C-alpha cells in the first residue's frame, strides 16, 4: 500500500472544516445529570478543547425532548419520576434554569424542544428563554426524529403523519418561533432518523422563504441496532463509506440552500447501544466515520450520550471511561487546527489514509487499519507515504489488545500510551511518540489490525 501526499489539497478534499467538528449530544432529560452528577463530563470536554482550542459543540435533545414541557415557574432544571435510575422518564418538565445551565457552556449549544405534543406556545416560550439564557446558542430544534411520530401524536392533529405533513408542520413552527422571537437563521431543521420516509432533500424542497429561519439541516445516523450488531461490519473502512452514502443527497440539499448539514445525533447502535457499543472497535468506527462524513460535507457530528448508568455508546459515565472516547480523542487530535482533509485511498478496502492540511499545506496523515481482530496472530499492513520531506517524521498510535477491548473490563485502549482515569477523565500515563525515516521523500509505517496512526509532518 503506497499513498502520495499532495503538496496542496486534492480536488476530492473536504471543504474548509469547522474549528471543532467532533461534538457531543446529551439526551434531553439527562443533560442536568451530566453537568451536576457526572464528574468526568467537565474534564472529558476540557481534554478535547485542549487539543483543538475550541469547546466541542454540544446538543441537548433526543426522544425525551418530545416528552418534555417547559414550566416557566419551576425552580428545578428538570422534574421527572422513574421506577429505576436505568429508565428514561415517560414525561418531564424543565424550568428556565435548564437553559441557564446550558448557557454556562462556552462552546456552541444546540437545544431541542418539543413538537410531538403540539404545544406551540409552550415551545415558543422555551425558545425565547433559550435565546435569553444561552449566549453561545447555535440552533434550536423543533421536534426530534419526527419520522417516528404517528397519527396518534398530538402534532398529527387526527390526520396521517406523512413526510408532507411533517414538512408543512416544520415551516409553520419555524415561522411561529422566529416570528415571535424576531429572529432568523435559528432552527435546526428536519432532525430525521436516516433518509426515509422523511428527508432533508424533501424538506428543503418545501421550505421556500422559511429557509431564512433555518440555521442548519440535521440528520440522525445510527448504523446498527441491537439486532444487526456486528462490530467488524460497523468499523470496516469500506463499510462506513457505504453506510453514509444515503446522506450525500441530504448534505447536497442543505448546501444548495447555503445552510450547513450536521449529524445532530449519532452513535454506533440504537436503544442505547449493544454489546459492540463500548468496544475499542466502536471508537475506531467513530474515528473513521468522522473523517468520511466531513469529506462528504457535513459540518459537525454530535455523538449521543444517553441515560446515566444505562448507556453502552457513552464515552464516559459516573464511574468508568468508555473505549469509544479514544476514537473521539484521536479524531479531535487529527483535525486540531486543520483546514481540510482528503482521502488518499479509494475506500474499497479495510485500509484508510487521509492527508490533513492547514493553510493548504499537508501537516498530518491519518492511517487506519479497520481489520477485525479478536484472537490468534494479529495481522498487520504496511503503509508507504510518498512526497514527503526531511530525513524523519513523528507518529502517535491508537491501539488496544483487540477490536472488542473494553475499558470497563480492564482492557483500555491507549493513545500514544496514555489512558483516561475512571471516574474523572484525567489523562494518565507517559506519552510515547514514534519516529520513522524519510528517504527520497518516502516513509513506511506498520499498523496492526484494529489500529490508527497519526503521522505529524
Ligand X SMILES: *[C@@H]1O[C@H](CO)[C@@H](O)[C@H](O)[C@H]1NC(C)=O
Ligand Y SMILES: C[C@@H]1O[C@@H](O[C@H]2[C@H](O)[C@@H](O)[C@H](O)O[C@@H]2C(=O)O)[C@H](O)[C@H](O)[C@H]1O
Ligand Z SMILES: C[C@@H]1O[C@@H](O[C@H]2[C@H](O)[C@@H](O)[C@@H](O)O[C@@H]2C(=O)O)[C@H](O)[C@H](O)[C@H]1O
CB atoms within 10 A of CB 120: 18
**Partners of 78 in the β-ladder:** 94
Which 3 state secondary structure label does DSSP give 200? Answer: helix
**Minimum CB separation from ligand MAN for residue 397, in Å?**
11
Residues with Cβ < 8 Å from 42, sequence gap 6 or more? none
Q: Which is nearer to ligand MAN, 135 or 382 (CB)?
A: 382
Contact string (CB under 6 A) for ligand MAN, positions 426-455, x = contact: ------------------xxx---------
Closest alpha carbon to 412 in 276, 320, 290? 320
69 binds, among ligand Y, ligand MAN, ligand Z, none (CB under 5 to 8 A by kind): none
Contacts of ligand X in 68-127 (CB under 6 A): 120-121, 124
**Partners of 398 in the β-ladder:** 415, 452
d(CA 340, CA 363): 10
446 binds, among ligand X, ligand MAN, ligand Y, none (CB under 5 to 8 A by kind): ligand MAN
Whole-angstrom distance between the N-terminal and C-terminal Cα of the chain? 19
278 binds, among ligand X, ligand Y, ligand MAN, none (CB under 5 to 8 A by kind): none
Closest alpha carbon to 188 in 240, 263, 125? 263
Contacts of ligand MAN in 378-407 (CB under 6 A): 380, 382
d(CA 24, CA 337): 19
Q: Which is nearer to ligand Y, 27 or 371 (CB)?
A: 27
d(CA 277, CA 421): 20
Of the candidates 118, 180, 184, 233, which one interacts with ligand X according to CB under 6 A?
Answer: 180
19 binds, among ligand X, ligand Y, ligand Z, none (CB under 5 to 8 A by kind): none
**Minimum CB separation from ligand X for residue 69, in Å?**
14
Cβ-count burial 247-268 (b if 16+ within 10 Å, e if not): beebbebbbebebbbbbbbbbb
Helices (H), 257-319: 280-296
Point out which span in 41-49, 92-100, 109-117, 266-274 binds ligand Y (CB under 6 A): 266-274
Of the candidates 64, 224, 298, 399, which one interacts with ligand Y according to CB under 6 A?
Answer: 64
Cell digits of residue 104: 454556562
Q: Which residue is nearest to ligand Y (CB)?
A: 306
Instruction: Give the number of residues written for the chain.
Output: 457
Q: Which is nearer to ligand X, 230 or 238 (CB)?
A: 238
145 binds, among ligand Z, ligand Y, ligand MAN, none (CB under 5 to 8 A by kind): ligand Y
Q: Which is nearer to ligand MAN, 357 or 368 (CB)?
A: 368
Q: Which is nearer to ligand Z, 33 or 202 (CB)?
A: 33
Task: Determine if 297 is a binding residue for ligand X (CB under 6 A).
Answer: no
Residues at the site binding ligand X, with contacts judged by CB under 6 A: 10, 12, 120-121, 124, 175-176, 179-180, 343, 346-347
Amino acid at each position: 500500500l503506497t499513498f502520495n501526499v499532495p503538496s496542496s489539497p486534492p480536488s476530492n478534499s473536504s471543504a474548509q472544516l469547522s474549528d471543532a467538528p467532533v461534538g457531543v449530544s446529551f439526551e434531553f432529560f439527562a443533560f442536568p445529570g451530566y453537568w451536576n452528577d457526572v464528574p468526568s463530563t467537565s474534564t472529558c470536554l476540557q481534554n478535547l478543547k485542549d487539543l483543538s482550542g475550541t469547546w466541542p459543540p454540544i446538543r441537548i435533545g433526543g426522544t425525551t425532548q418530545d416528552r418534555a414541557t417547559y414550566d416557566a415557574s419551576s425552580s428545578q432544571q428538570v422534574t421527572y419520576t422513574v421506577a429505576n435510575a436505568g429508565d428514561a422518564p415517560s414525561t418531564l418538565t424543565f424550568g428556565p434554569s435548564f437553559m441557564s445551565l446550558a448557557g454556562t457552556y462556552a462552546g456552541q449549544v444546540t437545544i431541542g424542544f418539543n413538537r410531538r405534543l403540539n404545544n406551540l406556545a409552550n415551545t415558543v416560550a422555551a425558545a425565547s428563554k433559550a435565546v435569553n439564557e444561552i449566549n453561545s446558542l447555535h440552533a434550536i430544534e423543533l421536534g426530534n426524529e419526527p419520522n417516528f411520530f404517528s397519527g396518534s401524536d398530538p402534532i398529527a392533529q387526527g390526520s396521517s403523519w406523512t413526510a408532507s405533513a411533517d414538512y408543512a408542520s416544520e415551516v409553520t413552527w419555524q415561522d411561529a418561533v422566529c416570528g415571535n422571537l424576531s429572529a432568523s437563521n435559528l432552527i435546526s431543521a428536519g432532525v430525521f432518523f436516516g433518509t426515509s420516509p422523511m428527508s432533508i432533500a424533501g424538506l428543503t424542497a418545501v421550505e421556500g422563504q422559511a429557509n431564512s429561519y433555518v440555521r442548519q439541516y440535521c440528520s440522525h445516523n445510527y448504523p446498527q441496532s441491537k439486532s444487526t450488531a456486528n462490530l467488524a461490519n460497523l468499523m470496516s473502512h469500506s463499510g462506513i463509506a457505504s453506510q453514509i452514502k444515503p446522506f450525500a443527497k441530504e448534505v447536497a440539499a442543505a448546501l444548495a440552500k447555503n445552510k450547513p448539514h450536521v449529524f445532530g445525533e449519532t452513535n454506533s447502535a440504537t436503544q442505547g447501544g449493544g454489546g459492540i457499543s463500548p468496544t475499542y472497535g466502536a471508537g475506531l468506527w467513530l474515528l473513521d466515520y468522522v473523517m468520511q462524513a466531513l469529506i462528504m460535507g457535513t459540518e459537525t457530528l454530535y455523538f449521543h450520550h444517553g441515560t446515566i448508568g444505562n448507556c453502552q455508546y457513552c464515552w464516559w459515565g459516573k464511574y468508568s471511561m468508555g473505549s469509544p472516547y479514544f476514537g473521539a480523542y484521536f479524531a479531535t487530535m487529527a483535525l486540531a487546527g486543520a483546514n481540510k482533509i482528503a482521502p488518499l485511498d479509494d475506500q474499497t478496502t479495510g485500509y484508510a489514509a487521509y492527508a490533513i492540511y492547514k493553510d493548504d499545506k499537508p501537516i498530518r496523515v491519518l492511517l487506519y487499519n479497520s481489520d477485525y481482530y479478536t484472537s490468534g496472530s494479529r495481522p498487520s499492513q504496511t503503509f508507504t507515504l510518498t512526497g514527503l520531506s526531511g530525513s524523519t517524521v513523528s507518529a502517535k498510535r491508537l491501539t488496544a489488545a483487540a477490536s472488542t477491548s473494553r475499558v470497563d473490563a480492564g482492557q483500555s485502549p491507549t493513545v500514544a500510551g496514555q489512558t483516561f482515569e475512571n471516574g474523572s477523565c484525567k489523562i494518565q500515563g507517559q506519552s510515547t511518540v514514534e519516529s520513522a525515516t524519510v528517504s527520497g521523500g518516502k516513509a513506511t509505517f506498520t499498523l496492526q489490525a484494529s489500529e490508527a496512526l497519526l503521522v505529524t509532518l
